[PDB]
Write a protein that binds this DNA or RNA. Structure first.
Length: 71
DNA sequence: AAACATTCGTTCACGTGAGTTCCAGTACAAGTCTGGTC
């Protein structure tokens, strides 16, 4: 239904769960279409440019600029 | 009366179960890099 209404996803919560600051995966869960395999459309695009990287990956092209073709 | 077969307590090797140490696989959390717009 969320996919029908063009929404991000759904959340599932446990009724007997207390509040715990800064804690993940205790009583709250999320489901998005991306997390389910096959439910998304993927794009095949070309790499037309590159950028240099920051500290952990310095002397290599870390991010890229992609382009689609013209019929 | 003498020779041969059987039996018995002993011995060794080999196999299997339980305890201990070490390492690989798994899980989770935090850190680091990136993307997009307003």
């Amino acid at each position: 239904e969320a996919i029908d209404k063009r929404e991000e996803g759904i959340m599932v919560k446990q009724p007997l769960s207390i509040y715990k600051p800064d804690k993940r995966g205790e009583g709250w869960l999320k489901i998005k279409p991306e997390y389910v395999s096959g439910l998304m459309d993927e794009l095949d695009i070309l790499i037309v440019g590159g950028y240099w990287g920051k500290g952990s990956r310095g002397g290599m092209m870390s991010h890229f600029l992609c382009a689609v073709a013209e019929k």
